[PDB]
Design a protein around this ligand. Sequence first.
Ligand SMILES: O=C(NO)c1cn(-c2cc(Cl)ccc2Oc2ccc(F)cc2)nn1
Ligand SMILES: [K+]
Ligand SMILES: [K+]
Ligand SMILES: [Zn+2]
Length: 401
Amino acid sequence: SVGIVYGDQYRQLCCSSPKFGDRYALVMDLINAYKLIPELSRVPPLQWDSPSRMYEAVTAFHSTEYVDALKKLQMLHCEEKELTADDELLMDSFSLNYDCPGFPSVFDYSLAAVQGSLAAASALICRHCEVVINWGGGWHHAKRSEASGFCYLNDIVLAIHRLVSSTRVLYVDLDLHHGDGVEEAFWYSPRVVTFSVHHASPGFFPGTGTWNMKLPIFLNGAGRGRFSAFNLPLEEGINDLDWSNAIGPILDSLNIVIQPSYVVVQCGADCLATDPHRIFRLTNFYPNLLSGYLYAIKKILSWKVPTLILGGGGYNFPDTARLWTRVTALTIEEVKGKKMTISPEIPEHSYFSRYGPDFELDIDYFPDSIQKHHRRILEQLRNYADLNKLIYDYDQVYQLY
Ligand SMILES: O=C(NO)c1cn(-c2cc(Cl)ccc2Oc2ccc(F)cc2)nn1
Ligand SMILES: [K+]
Ligand SMILES: [K+]
Ligand SMILES: [Zn+2]
């Protein structure tokens, strides 16, 4: 069974931010327009019975002072007065500025994603669902005491913490950007293995997930977490097939060696060829019998491990809905076995006009370094397995590449 996080108030809050606008409404309404909702179990966002319980949940990762400042930022933006000099300094000390500004619902908006992803983790733990989707979540850049990349609270870190505290988790980050906040949270933890594939290049946000400065080294975790943070930075312009071939054997080898209890996938849509970043050239194409995204999700779901699928980046809202609608239909198909039939034409619904001018489900796109990374990653995986007394066929894994 496949769950999906939704609710009336949740939708309103997920649509209340200045950067992401009504994206979540387009996503859920396109899923609904394609008649997928009856196949999915609604997972209600988590609520608490007191402010103390909410604070206890969020400060399992974030500092109390950061959570206080974020709540104060919302309060200050609900009045018409400007911030005092001292309040500006306070907000700047948590990077609550620039690309992470305040707005009247900023705390409720950020908290909603946490509520959604925590409920999704719980649904997996109690075996209510085999997969849960949360397209309102996936905010991988937020740090313990710092907003980053329009991520204010790290719903992913909190969801993973709930999963491990119930056990190994494999986290897979498909966003265009490095999953730095999740990687940092579990830097010292061998039980949460993180793997991000992303673009990296000089000056490109957030800057990590690649060689860093003698001669540059690839960091991969620390303490008992040594070798437990994996990264695959890729040059711009990569297409569906090359991205699939780059990530495929890594994913299979991580699953073989780690044998995760849970998989958490961040599925940010900014690798699409039609994202305004214009960096990678992935699609949402799906042969009627191939999108890098759909390739990766189908492979992960074939492992039959309880899986959380989250959203993330994606600044072309209709094309993000086009992709996540196909991910949703694929999840139903792989988990249930029930074939899912999706018309090539966008169905009439509230946001139909946003899919002009051609109103198709396919996005409007005409389609050695990696060998070195594979050897480095395969070596790190062996080192990880040696440090953690795990054993595996050091030949069947090698064969995968
Ligand atoms: O999605 C993200 N990470 O997961 C993410 C993306 N940025 C980001 C960083 C810089 Cl310096 C500039 C624009 C950024 O976003 C965009 C890019 C294009 C756009 F049309 C709308 C938003 N920051 N975080
Ligand atoms: K990524
Ligand atoms: K780790
Ligand atoms: Zn991104």
